[PDB]
From Swiss-Prot, chains A, B:
Gene3D superfamilies: Spore Coat Polysaccharide Biosynthesis Protein SpsA, Chain A. The gene is gpgS. It catalyses: an NDP-alpha-D-glucose + (2R)-3-phosphoglycerate = (2R)-2-O-(alpha-D-glucopyranosyl)-3-phospho-glycerate + a ribonucleoside 5'-diphosphate + H(+); (2R)-3-phosphoglycerate + UDP-alpha-D-glucose = (2R)-2-O-(alpha-D-glucopyranosyl)-3-phospho-glycerate + UDP + H(+). This is Glucosyl-3-phosphoglycerate synthase. GO terms for molecular function: hexosyltransferase activity; magnesium ion binding; protein homodimerization activity. Keywords: Calcium, Cobalt, Glycosyltransferase, Iron, Magnesium, Manganese, Metal-binding, Transferase. It is an enzyme of class 2 (transferase). Was identified as a high-confidence drug target. (2R)-3-phosphoglycerate binds at G150, R151, V152, T153, N226. GO terms for biological process: UDP-alpha-D-glucose metabolic process. The keyword Iron applies. The keyword Repeat does not apply. It comes from Mycobacterium tuberculosis (strain ATCC 25618 / H37Rv). Involved in the biosynthesis of 6-O-methylglucose lipopolysaccarides (MGLPs). Catalyzes the transfer of the glucose moiety from UDP-alpha-D-glucose (UDP-Glc) to the position 2 of 3-phospho-D-glycerate (3-PGA) to form glucosyl-3-phosphoglycerate (GPG).
Length: 284, 284
C-alpha cells in the first residue's frame, strides 16, 4: 500500500533460501569505523557466522581511529582496511562518505551491505534481512532499513524530503546507516562528503531509477550512541547541504556557527563540504 | 563584534530612563494564547505593573482556547480579545501567525511587543529589555531575544539560515517568541501561517532593511513546555515551508507524514500552509 516496496514484518526467507537465490552473485559487508572500540566486536561477531556462506567477504573500513578499534576488530577475525590502503594514490579526506566510497575499491561483491560499527548488540539477521529484496525481487537496487529518537531524521531530513522530493515521503528512515545495494548502482553514483552520504545516495537512486528500484525492510529494534545536540547541529548542516545540492538549489557553503554559554558565550564554526567524490567507475 | 547589534549582558537602562526616551511613542504588549491556563496568569502578572507607565496597553489574544485561559486572564486584570473580535469581518484560520496578525488590528501602540503565554515565571524585565534598542537606538526596527534545547532552532532554522541566508547566521534564537518591533514595520510585512510566523518576519525584515535594523538582547534564562517530537515534526515542516518561500524556492505544499509504531505502524499527515496573510496596511 506504500508505493515503495515495504516489508513491515519479519522476512520469511531462510538462510538456505537466500543462498540458493544468489545464483553466482557475491555479497560483501563493510563496517565503517571511527573510534568504536566499545561496540565493534559485538557488530563483527553478529555477522561473522555468515562468512563463507551467505556472505563472501567482510571488512572493517577503519576511518582514522586512535582507540583500540583496529586491534579488537582483528581479534574478532575481521580484515581491517585503512582509508589509505583502500585507495593509496589518493590523499584521504575526513568524514563518513569518504570511508564508504573508499570501501568500494577494497571489496568485490556484486552486492554491498553497509552496517554501522556503533550498534549495540545488533540482531544477527540484519544482513539477511537487508539482502532479501535484492536477491528475490526484480529490479530492486537499494534497500534501506527502518526500526523502532532520530532527531535529525524527524526534524530535518523527512520534512525537507516532504518539501522538496515528496515522492520519498514514504521512506521511514532515510538517514539509516544500515543498507544494501548493487555494486553496479554504487559505483555509478557520486558519494557526498561527511554525514551527507546516505541522503545523497537515496535522492540520486530515486532521481535516476524512481521508486521501483528502492525497498525498505523492518529490522525491528536498533541501539547506538546518542550524540550531543551541537554535533547534531553540524551533521544536520551537512545533510541540508547535500540535499539542497541534489535538488538543484545553491547552498552558501558557509558552515554552521554555534554560540556556547559559559551570560557569557563562546563561538565555534563547523566545516561543511560541497564537494562529492565522483562515481567510483571513473577510477578504473 | 557581531555585525548585528547584540546586548550580551543585562541592559543598564532604568524604567524611568526608558519612559523618558518614549517621546510620545506608545507601547502595546500582546500575549497570544491557546490553552495556557497553567501559565497565563504568571505571565500577565510579570508585566501588568508596567501598565500606565512604560506599557500603555496589554492584551491577551485568545486563539481558540477551550480550557480556563480566558477566565484566568480576566481575573488577572487583562483585556482578552478573541480572533473573531480582533477582525470580525474575516473568517478565522488556525495557527499562531493568524493570532499575531489579528493582534495588530486590536492594538494601537507605535511599538508592539510579543511575549508567549506558556513561559514559566518570566522575568518582569523582559519587556523593558526588549524595547531598549527601539527606544534608545537609531534605526532599530525589530528586536529578538536570546537566552539559556531548542531542537527545531538548532537542527532546522539555524542550519537552514547558514545554507540560504548566511548573513543571519549571527542570530542566536531566530524562532524566539519574545520580541518587539515598530508598528510601521509589522503592518508593512505579510505574516506567515502557523509556526512559520517568526522566521518569516525575521527574513523579511532582513531582506527589506538589512542587519542594521535588527538587534538581539539577552533575556538570561527562559522556561516553557517541551512539546513531543511528532509535534515538533509538523512545526519544523511549516518553518521549512516559510523559509524556502522567503528564499524564493518552491515548496511542494505536501504535509509531513509520520508513521507511528504500535512491529505495527500507523500513519498521520499534518497540515502545512503556503498562504500568508498580507500586510495589515491593506486592511485600512
Ligand atoms: O568520519 C567518520 C565518521 C563516522 N564514521 C562511522 O560511521 C558511523 C556513523 O557515525 P556516528 O557519528 O553517527 O556514530 P558515533 O560517532 O556516535 O559512534 C559509525 O560507525 C562511525 O564509526 C566513520 O567511519 N568515519
Ligand atoms: O495556534 C496557536 C498556537 C500557538 N499559540 C500560542 O503561541 C505560543 C507558542 O506555542 P507553542 O506550541 O510553541 O507552546 P505550547 O503549545 O507548548 O504551550 C503559545 O503561547 C501558544 O499558546 C497560539 O496562540 N495559537
Ligand atoms: Mn549512530
Ligand atoms: Mn513554547
Amino acid at each position: 500500500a506504500l508505493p515503495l516496496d515495504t516489508t513491515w514484518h519479519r522476512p520469511g526467507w531462510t538462510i538456505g533460501e537466500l543462498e540458493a537465490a544468489k545464483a553466482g552473485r557475491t555479497i560483501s559487508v563493510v563496517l565503517p569505523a571511527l573510534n568504536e572500540e566499545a561496540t565493534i566486536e559485538s557488530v563483527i561477531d553478529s555477522i561473522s557466522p555468515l562468512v563463507d556462506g551467505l556472505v563472501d567477504e567482510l571488512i572493517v573500513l577503519d576511518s582514522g581511529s586512535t582507540d583500540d578499534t583496529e586491534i579488537r576488530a582483528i581479534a574478532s577475525g575481521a580484515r581491517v582496511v585503512s582509508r589509505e590502503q583502500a585507495l593509496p594514490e589518493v590523499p584521504v579526506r575526513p568524514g563518513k562518505g569518504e570511508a564508504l566510497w573508499r570501501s568500494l575499491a577494497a571489496t568485490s561483491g556484486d552486492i554491498v551491505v553497509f552496517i554501522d560499527s556503533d550498534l549495540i548488540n545488533p540482531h544477527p539477521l540484519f544482513v539477511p534481512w537487508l539482502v532479501g529484496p535484492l536477491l528475490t525481487g526484480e529490479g530492486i537496487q537499494l534497500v534501506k532499513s527502518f526500526y523502532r529518537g532520530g532527531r535529525v531524521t524527524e526534524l530535518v531530513a523527512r520534512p525537507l524530503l516532504a518539501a522538496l522530493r515528496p515522492e520519498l515521503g514514504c521512506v521511514l528512515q532515510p538517514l539509516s546507516g544500515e543498507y544494501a545495494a548493487s555494486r553496479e548502482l554504487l559505483t555509478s553514483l557520486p558519494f557526498a562528503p561527511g554525514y551527507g552520504v546516505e541522503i545523497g545516495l537515496l535522492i540520486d537512486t530515486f532521481d535516476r531509477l524512481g521508486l521501483d528500484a528502492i525497498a525498505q525492510v523492518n529490522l525491528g529494534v536498533r541501539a547506538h550512541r546518542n550524540r550531543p545536540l551541537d554535533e547534531l547541529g553540524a551533521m544536520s548542516r551537512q545533510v541540508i547541504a547535500t540535499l539542497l545540492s541534489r535538488c538543484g538549489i545553491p547552498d552558501s557553503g558557509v558552515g554552521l556557527t554555534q554560540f556556547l554559554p559559559g551570560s557569557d558565550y563562546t563561538r565555534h564554526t563547523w566545516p561543511v563540504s560541497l564537494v562529492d567524490r565522483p562515481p567510483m567507475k571513473v577510477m578504473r
